[model samples]
Target chain A: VIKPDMKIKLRMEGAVNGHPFAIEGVGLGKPFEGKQSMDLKVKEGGPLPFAYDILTTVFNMVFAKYPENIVDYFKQSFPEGYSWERSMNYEDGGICNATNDITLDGDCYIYEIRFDGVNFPANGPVMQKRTVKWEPSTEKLYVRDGVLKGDVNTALSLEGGGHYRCDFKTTYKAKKVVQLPDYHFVDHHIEIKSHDKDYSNVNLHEHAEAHSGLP
Target chain B: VIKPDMKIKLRMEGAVNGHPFAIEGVGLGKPFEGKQSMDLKVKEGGPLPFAYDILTTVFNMVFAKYPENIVDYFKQSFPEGYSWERSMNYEDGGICNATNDITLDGDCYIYEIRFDGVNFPANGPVMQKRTVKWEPSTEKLYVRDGVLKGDVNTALSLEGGGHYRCDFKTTYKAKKVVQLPDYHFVDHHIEIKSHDKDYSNVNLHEHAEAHSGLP
Candidate 1:
């Protein structure tokens, strides 16, 4: 049994425009852009409700069956003056950085979701739209499965803008006594780094090495 | 400037009663009533070609914010039995325990999600769901925030059976370098213990004092 009284820990690291922002304090300040980390004590329960598997199944349907519907959803969720691009990872020759295009000066945010923790597929075109609620005030980002949360935090910069990185670490407690099972599992983590120039020449290895440690 | 090359670490803990199972390299045997913890390392991309946030938001709006259509979606998505519940904090006496009555005979899996991390309203009459997904080859749980994913190696026997105590801890890393304004910040932690039948009516403080560091 699962309830709202469980505790979890999260650590994140990365660079924004080549600056170091180590993971240490709770607040993010201007100046250095290296790696950064924050620890939070979460109360067991909250208003938004659903299980991780259900959410994952929903995502699979959207990306696999109804591509247009996803685009429309983005159109409805975002506002005006926001633009986005779409593409597949396969077209880029088996690479993770294979995204559509660098969405230029738009107010909207971009998002990418991976399944099984590897192998980004084609035909599941990238979706983009304007921002609805993501603002400077939004503190924490929420995710189910390895799915990414595209809020204001994910909005990319055109030039000399800092990048966005979010790491989600979760722990579960049994609300009631139960038996244990043996199995191999995978947890989800997302990194949305922005660069001063276009991401056309970006490589997956570079991205991998940057966030390899908890800043 | 968040992109797909970030690295992250996720840790989780939960309780189980009965026997322990062998894990990675340790023999987590049965008749065990304590906590279990696992750490995973993953790359920052999705198996599907979408962003994590987009999936979370889309699911929240479809199944959570709008529940009338959830039954239809659930039927199409899952062939087995699945259910959901929702709630908020500080309402109806300022304390609420979101519990699920498990009825499945053999090994049953429970999945829970908390949505308040995204600034969703914490008002009254919120939706919280406890769903039972089809049994997979293995059961997996995810925790999104906090520190010290509770202790689960101990067990407490109840009137009917034993109950395991676990908590949820989550950690959130910033996706971009942003500004922070002066404001009030809050954090929380939880501790659980079991008592003997003779001490059934004992106070919580008394229990904590005795087992504060028993380990």
Candidate 2:
């Protein structure tokens, strides 16, 4: 149950490998001001650690349909080396364009977003020890011309030892403002896939630093 | 993640229309012993108060893939005057039959079940109250020749002023045994629908008493 022009302030805090980590962002139905930030401690060749918990929390908060249920589906898509994401896009006249740029005008209404996650290794809990490299592209766009655009590159670590990457494009002109006496279910695009590749030789700390756009 | 020949013990207790109500059933993967029991108070022209909470819990436990997520989907399908259910069916060569009879052979291995629920008044909480007609058909079959069969009829009350009914055919010749070295994802059938009918004339107590096979 999402409304038009709704804004949600997000604050997340925890420790990654006992290192202080926190994220501050605003989840809006339309474009807003400021950037979503996450302060982290990137250990040498170690995992980012809090990726699963953090991402699931953010995604769950934004998509408030069945808040509790959304997380489970989100978690299911993240067994060990699995990666998932939800992004915003602008759809106009048969052209569904995805964006990471943070400066477009309010020419349209923000109505929908998308869910791109994974669900395999597919069964049970994954407890095998391994190293993973995680590369996540995060962005915050300025509310200009009804379009929010930005290029974001953030790094999150994983457990065991391997590499996982994701792209969250916060772009919405996603849906236009339409006023008819009544409306039905709104469709949002959801993408999910799995890759069977080994990441044991991949170093986490190096991966995070290389992908970080953070100072 | 459901396994074959698995048995789950179920225990649930709550108040239905302020009266003590509890349900005892063994959620099994194959045929098993005992029956599912629910003690309730059927209020006259009122609702089977604990129906929503109880059913969601039972269904969630039996099908424990994403237990947390399953309930939200179940809750979403139960707005005011809305009803839902999950049933078992036996699929044989060229024949897919549903049953409520409790004396059958277990000639097959249980691998899948089905989900039959609803999802709308489809918007936010249905605040405008109304009476509904609930006719639920429930059954629990016995294990014979590898087939579990049973006919169950229980009475549950609802809130507001309405009658809501459902059918759970606990039949599972449902899946046959196959030992192919490797198996993939199992597909369970899920059915959901909506009805725009008025139940102002239906009486809750009479409806429960008339349809109940419970002592």
Candidate 3:
């Protein structure tokens, strides 16, 4: 019963440090699975080898645990609202100011999670290894049938120095329905957010409110 | 500078339990924060409300330390590939699963955990109160920049009956240039797998696998 039409198209549009970059390609998929098969490539960006793990992760969510499968992935981390520390470790990531408001609406759902400028590396990693750290951001996801779609506007920072920004859209049509063009691995379908932005570039957002709402 | 553009939009189209529903709203945000405000309505589904908190946690991750404040969220759940169990209880709750295939990528992260899915009816609450019981499922998330994305192809069962599924995708566009939408929340954004699958429905997935690769 797990017949995923497989074959999905991907597109990434963002910047690293400040330079804009985009990657598009095709990926093979398993019904009710996450990031698989990679034909992804950096269509436009610097010559640096972009992190494929991160690129694929950003584009892979739409197809994670769905399709024809017997599954559900849940979390109850908000026993009393959630929070963390700033000087926390990469492995001990924290969410100081964020919220995930979910509810039951008939058979379908309307979901959204917000992370201000939180970089929650909630677990453990090496002290001075090649690590990737990102600041608090936000994303919205919705699912209907086998189709998944959403918009992303967040910033990413590599542990060392280089930071990248991603502001694009994602769509996972699932199995046979998705009308993917001829995609290989370059993440061709992914678009780029022309405007350049990163942590050091942030100016007016610092004084932003400490508390946020979903209503 | 710890800045945020604030505000994000929301939308969802899907079904759950055995009913049809749809909703879309807006939400507010702050970096390193926790679950936000919600105005979700159970348009249609089972008579009982499902356990979304746990579902999201299994699929969601983040940061900080305050009464909480300024800490990014990170996940260190995969110490040695990863696995927990059912019957165990901390302050939060338990996993009920048999294993965790979360491999420690490399010389990375040292982990610390404080699970309390106990729903202990903190002070001045009712005992033997109505709570939701769910099974343990797997979820995979990869972060590039702060743009985290992945899938949740796991399953959950209802203590009462009816199994709602959320085989969707996720993208965490946190921080700066990552302008979140004006999202309110119905997390109704969460859709139920059209097909019914639960603990009893999970015959193969239980022993599905301990290790997974992206290549």
Candidate 4:
């Protein structure tokens, strides 16, 4: 929902540790001018904080689309380090790009977010158009079990997307071959081989960060 | 996912036109840095453009929950204006607040967004683990155009929910009421009427700078 002709407007100056360096935008305190400023209707307390916008509004809107029911999932994990974000960069009333991804994998969920807008700059006399796509995982669900099913299940239970028991039948029921997805549904989490790209994946060890919520 | 334990990692310094101001984190480039650094696994490219991640990835994930489908809706209204946005702000990863409101309202749809994170750092980390509720207009839905008249069309929109347009007779007969809502959602966009409160908001106005594709 980010575009020039709509009801909201935004601008941000890339910053580092609170220092608004090359980041151009505007701010609302004391009328100080920022490199980028967003104009939207807000209530009570000055304009709402930026993080509020991404996680709540933007996030909820898209969470409904994920294959898994993550609303309650996240609600339950809001604190156990579920760091997430929403960021975008675009021209005045032109094409735009944006994203809001998650850092942790929680019970039955892995959040990934992306959004794009075009010709935006709230009120910029241009048609503001945008699109979005968010999924819990990029991996496919159908898979072969690893040599250690109990180890895998035991390990996963400690964090998000758990519920897969050691025995496939114990966790998921199977029909004689014929079935569809969504219409059927199955866990996509799989065991990645050492040679697989998963080998280079970032921060695999849950560590304290998992509970810290910090990036 | 943005939590860091996942694939993507992003840090933006709010900007004022290309001038980054008070906002910091980290980046991955030349061991050096690019404008806005998003440490996500983007292929064929070095971690997709920051703006690209925000607009395309994050935006889509959330748009579905909006009152109406505005993707193609705005394209047809270009130049004239379609104003739209979804932004958030919160202290470091600890706490977060986000938003994504509607641009031009077509159907009976009105949109608002919000997501609050805890232990954030408008400037470090302290009290983490917070939540919220977001919605531009706090109106609820579930009403038929007329009295119940359903002796036909048995249908279900699966996932989210749906309403069809047609003669009352064509509409899948009658069912008394319906329902809705969330954990935390906020209207990054607020409406301050009269002496209400202009308060400050983030990012404002979209400019040819749109070409800049950045804050």
**Best-matching candidate per DockQ:** 2
**Which portions of model 1 miss their true places by more than 4 Å?**
A1-155, A158-215, B1-71, B78-215
Write the residue-wise lDDT of candidate 1 on B1-215 in tens digits. Answer: 11112111111111111111111111111111111211221122212121111111101000111112112221122213232222111211111111111112122222222121111111212112111111111111122221101111212123344332222211211223222212111111111222223221111110010011222
**Model 2 spans > 4 angstroms off:** A1-34, A39-215, B1-34, B39-215
Best by lDDT: 3
Measured over all alpha carbons after superposition, the RMSD of each candidate to the real structure, in angstroms, is: 25.4, 18.5, 21.8, 25.8
* TM per prediction: 0.16, 0.24, 0.22, 0.17
Cα deviation of A87, candidate 2, in Å: 14
Stretches of candidate 3 off by over 4 Å are A32-35, A49-52, A61-215, B1-215
| Candidate DockQ scores, in order | 0.01, 0.04, 0.02, 0.01
lDDT of each: 0.18, 0.24, 0.28, 0.20
lDDT of 3: 0.28
**Model 3, position B46: C-alpha lDDT score:** 31
Rank candidates, TM-score, best first: 2, 3, 4, 1
Q: Give lDDT tens digits, candidate 4, residues A81-147.
A: 2322323222221222222333323222222332222213333222211211111222122222210
Q: Show model 4 residue runs off by greater than 4 Å.
A: A1-215, B1-91, B101-103, B106-110, B121-208, B212-215
**Residue-level lDDT tens digits of model 4 in B1-215:** 11211111222222211111222112221110101222222222222212221121121111112222112222233223222222222212221212223232222112222222221222211211121111122211111332111111111111233321111011111112222222122111221121111111122111000011123
Model 2 chain A is weakest, by summed lDDT over 10 consecutive residues, at A92-101
State the fnat of candidate 4 relative to the true structure: 0.00
List, residue by residue over B1-215, the lDDT tens digit for candidate 3: 22222332323222211112333333333323433232332222332133333322322222111122212222222223222211121222111111111223243221111111212222211122222333454545454444444345433444455443434233343322332222111111222222222211111101111123342
